[PDB]
Design a protein around this ligand. Sequence first.
Ligand SMILES: NC(=O)C1=CN([C@@H]2O[C@H](COP(=O)(O)OP(=O)(O)OC[C@H]3O[C@@H](n4cnc5c(N)ncnc54)[C@H](OP(=O)(O)O)[C@@H]3O)[C@@H](O)[C@H]2O)C=CC1
Ligand SMILES: [Zn+2]
Lengths: 208, 134, 126, 86, 114, 95, 297
Amino acid sequence: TRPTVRPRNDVAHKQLSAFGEYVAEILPKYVQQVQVSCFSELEICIHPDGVIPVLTFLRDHSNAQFKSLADLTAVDIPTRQNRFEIVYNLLSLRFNSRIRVKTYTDELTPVESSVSVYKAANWYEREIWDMFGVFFANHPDLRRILTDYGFEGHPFRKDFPLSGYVELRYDDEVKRVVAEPVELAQEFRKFDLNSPWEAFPAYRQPPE
Amino acid sequence: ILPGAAYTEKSATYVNTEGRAQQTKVAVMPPGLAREDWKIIRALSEIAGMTLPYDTLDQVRNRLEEVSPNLVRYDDVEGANYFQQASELSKLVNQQLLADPLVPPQLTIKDFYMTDSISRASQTMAKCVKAVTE
Amino acid sequence: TQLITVDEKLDITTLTGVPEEHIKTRKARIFVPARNNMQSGVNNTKKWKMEFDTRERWENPLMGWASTADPLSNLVLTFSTKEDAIAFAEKNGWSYDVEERKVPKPKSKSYGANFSWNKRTRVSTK
Amino acid sequence: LGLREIRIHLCQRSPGSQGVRDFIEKRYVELKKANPDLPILIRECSDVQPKLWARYAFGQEKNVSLNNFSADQVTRALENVLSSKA
Amino acid sequence: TSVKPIFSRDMNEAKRRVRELYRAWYREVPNTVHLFQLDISVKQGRDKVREMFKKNAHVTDPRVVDLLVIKGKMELEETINVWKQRTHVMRFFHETEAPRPKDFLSKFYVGHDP
Amino acid sequence: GVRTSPTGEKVTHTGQVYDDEDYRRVRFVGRQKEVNENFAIDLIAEQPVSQVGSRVISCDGGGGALGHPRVYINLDKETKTGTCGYCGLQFRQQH
Amino acid sequence: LHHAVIPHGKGGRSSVSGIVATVFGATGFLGRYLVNHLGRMGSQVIVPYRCEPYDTMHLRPMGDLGQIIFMDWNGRDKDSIRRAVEHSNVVINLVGREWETKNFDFEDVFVKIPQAIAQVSKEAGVEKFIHISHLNADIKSSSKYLRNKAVGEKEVRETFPEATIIKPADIFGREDRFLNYFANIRSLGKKTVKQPVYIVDVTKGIINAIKDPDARGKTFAFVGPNRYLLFDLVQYVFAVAHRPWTTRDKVERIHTTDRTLPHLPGLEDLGVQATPLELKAIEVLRRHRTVQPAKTV
Ligand SMILES: NC(=O)C1=CN([C@@H]2O[C@H](COP(=O)(O)OP(=O)(O)OC[C@H]3O[C@@H](n4cnc5c(N)ncnc54)[C@H](OP(=O)(O)O)[C@@H]3O)[C@@H](O)[C@H]2O)C=CC1
Ligand SMILES: [Zn+2]
C-alpha cells in the first residue's frame, strides 16, 4: 500500500490518544467523548456548560498551551435534537499540535461566548449567530456580520433553501432597490447522485 | 368543458379493489388553465351560491372521513364483516340467470392496451396494439 | 436554580425567517424513499427523508427553462429515525404526512426447488 | 323535506361499537326490508367511535354519536332518525 | 422540560423586555422617518411597528420571545446607527408587490397555489 | 437541408419552428433566427457504407483517442447495416 | 388561446402574464411607469422607440430577460407600426408632446399617429387597444392641444370600436410636467379648478383596463380624489418646495378647468383607489428643496 495510499502516522496517533486521556481525566465534569481520527486528529466532545472551563484550560495549561484559536464553526445536523454542533479548532504552537473541541446546542439554548478565552472568537461566533442562529451569551457586540441588514432567517441552516426567500432588483417606480419573493427563471436542478451500493463497510451502522 | 387534473397532477385518494385507500402526489402541475378537480367543483359551488364547507385538501379529507372514515387511513385494508346479512338480503329477489355465456370483454392482448382515455390517447399503446394485431 | 421550566410545545416558526405561505400551506412528506427498481442496491433506503409538495414549474419564455417560484422545491432533509423527522416537522410548524418504512418481507429461497420431483416450481430451463 | 341516506360508522374490535355490531348482526336485514330505497351505508373502520350520520334534503346532515350504546339504544336512535325526516 | 434560559425566567420578565423594546421602537420611528427621509407618515411607521409586534403575539415560550426581543434590538441598532439604507427600512412595506389573492376563487383563477 | 415554415421562419435540425400565432416570433423582429444549416442527419447519410470482410468490426470514429470510445459492431444481419452508436458510420459484411 | 400566452407563475419577474404589450411612447413619463408595472408581472413588452437607444436604458431593468423588445419605428411609417404590433395582444398608445415641433405638430402627434396606430392595430388582429386622451379635450376648447386631442380621440373611436380611451386630468409624479412645472415657475391664480391624478393610479388603471374584459369600448376619466382651485394648488406647491421653457398653449391649459364627466367611469370602476396629492407631493417636491394642506372645493 505504498504509492497511492496515505501513510499512517502511528506516533502522532499514540501521542494524541494519550493527551486525550489526559484532558478527559483532568476535566471529567464536562468531557463526554474523546476520539482520534485515522488521520490523527484529536476531538474532545464536551458538555456546553463547560465551553469556558475547557477552553481556558487548553489555552493556559502548561502541557497544552493551545494559544491559537484557528477556527470556530457550527454544523447544522437536523436529525439531532441539539441540531447545532459548535466546533473549536485550536493550535498549540508550543507543542506543534492541533485539537478539536466539539459541543452542541439547539436553537434556544445559549452557548457561553468564548471571547474571554480567545478574542479571535469575537467575529466567529458572531458569524455563528448570522448563519445558524445560535445565540452567544455575554458577547461584546453580537449582531449580523455577513448577511444583508434586513435579512430574515439563518442561511446555513439546512432547512433554509439554497436561494433565499427574497431577491432584490431596482424598481424605478419607487426609485429604490426592493425585495420581492424569489422566482428563478431556471430552477436549481437537484441531482440525486448517491449510489445504492454501500461504499465503505467500515462505517456500516447496525440495523434495527 | 371544465379541464381538470390527471393522476400525476394532484394529490388524490384512490381506493383499490380490496378496500385500501391510497393517495397520489403532485408530480407535475396540470397544463394550461386546467385545475385540480375538487377545486373546480368548489369554485362552481361558490359561483352558484351553494358554497361547500371546505377550502383546502385537508378539509376535503375531513369531509371524506365524515362520509366514510376509511378513505383517509392510507395503505390500510379495513376488513368488512357481515357476509351473512348480505347473503340474507340477496335472497329476496329471485333474479334469473340468463343463458348467455360468461364472456369477458378483454379476451386477448389486443383488447388490453386501450381501455381508458389516457391509454386511447397513448401512442405507445397504439404501437402495442398495432404490434399485436399483425 | 439556573434552569427554567417550559412546558409549552416546541415551536420556532417566528425565528426561522420563513414566510407564512411556506409554513402553513406546505405539506411535508416524511418517508423512506423506495429502492430504484433499476438497481438492486439498498443504501438509499437506509434513512428517512423529508421533502415538500411540488409547486408549479413553468416554461421560461426565452429559453424554455423550468422556472419555479417554490423556494422549498429542492429542500430534502435527512433523518435517522421517523421520530426525529416528525419532531423537526412539528418544531417548524410544517403540517406533515408520514409513510411507514416498507422493508421487504423475508423470502424462502431453495436452489433445489428448481429441480423438484412433483412440484410446479421446477425451472423449465436453467 | 326528507331523509335521503343513513351512515353508520363503527369498529370491528372496539367494545364501544359492540352494541352497534349487535344492531347489524341481528337487526339490519328487517331494517333493510323496511327501507329498500334507502341507502344505509355501514362503514367499519379500525379505531373509530360509533356514529350515525343522517343526510336530509338539500345537504343537511345531522349527527348522533352512538358510542357505548346497546342494540336497543341504537334501534331507538335510528327509528328516531327514520321518524324524524327533518 | 428543565431548560437553560436566555434572559427571562418566565413570561413576565419576557413581556417586560417586549414592552421596553416596543417603547424604544415607538420613540425611534419619527427619527427614522426624518433621517431616512421616508415618504410614509410617522403614524404609518408606528402602525407597521404595531403590526410587527402583533405578528409574534401568539408565542408563549420565554426563550423564543427573548430571541425575538434580541433580534428586535438588533434591527433597532441597525436602524438608529445608519447601517440600513432607506431601502432596508422600506422593505417592511412590501410596496412593489402586487396584492395576493385571499379568497378561494381568486386563488383558483390565478393558479395552483392553495 | 434546412426548410421553411409558411411564416417564412427557418426550421432547425430538431424540427423547431414557432407557430404563426405565437407571440415569441417578435424576438426575431429586426433581427435573425440563428440556425445551423449543416444538418448532421443529412451529412452522415452522405457517407458510404463500409464493406468489410470481418464479422465483428471496431469503430472509434477515427483519430484514435480523438474519436469516441471504441465499440464492436456485429454484422450478422444482412438486411440491416451495422451502425456505430457514436459516430453514425454504418458498416456491412461484404459476404 | 395559444399555449405560450397562458399565464403562469406567481405574478413575479420570471412569471408569465400572457400580456404581449406594444407600448408606443414608452420612452416618456407614462410609459416609464407603465413598462415598470407591465414587466414586473412578466409581460412581453414591445417598446417601439424613436429616440437614441441611450434614452431607453432605464426601460431595461424593468423586466426579465427577453421580456422587453426594443425596436425602431416612425410615426409616418405604417410598416414599422405593423412590424411592432403584429404579435401583440394589447397595444397602448402614449405618444404626446406638450409643444409642437418643426417636424410634428399637434395634428401629427394627436390625430395622424394615433389613427395610424389604431388602423394598423385593427388590420393586424390586435385584441385590445388603449388610447390616452386628456380630460379637458374639446373641439371648442381654447387650446390647440385639446382640440386636436378631441379630433384624434374621435378618430381612434371610429377606427377601433373597442378602444379603451382614458381621460387623465393632470398627471403628477416624479418626472411630471405639472408639479415640476409649478415648482420651477417661481402662471397665476384664477377661477380654474383642477383635480390632479397620481401616475401610479393611472398605471394601475391602464393595467386593470387590460385585465378587465368589460373595459373594451369604454371611456374612462382618471381623476384625482380632491378638486383644487388653481391658486391654492400653486401656493401648496410653493409651500412644499420651500419657496416664497413655456408656451401660450400651456398657459391656456393651466387656466383651463378640469371638467366633471360623471357619465364616464373613473379609477374606482377599475378597482383603483385614487391617491391624494398630499401623500405624494412631499415625495415629488423633495427634490426642489435647497405644511398646511390645500383647500379643496
Ligand atoms: N400630465 C401628463 O403627463 C398627462 C398626459 N396625457 C397624455 O398622455 C400621453 C403620454 O403622456 P406623457 O408621457 O406625459 O408625455 P411625454 O412627452 O413625456 O411622452 C410622449 C412619448 O411619445 C413619444 N413621442 C412624442 N412625440 C412623438 C412623435 N412625433 N413621434 C413618435 N414618438 C413621439 C416620446 O418619445 P421621445 O422621447 O422619442 O420623443 C415619448 O416616449 C400624451 O398623449 C399626453 O397628452 C394626458 C393627461 C395628463
Ligand atoms: Zn464510430
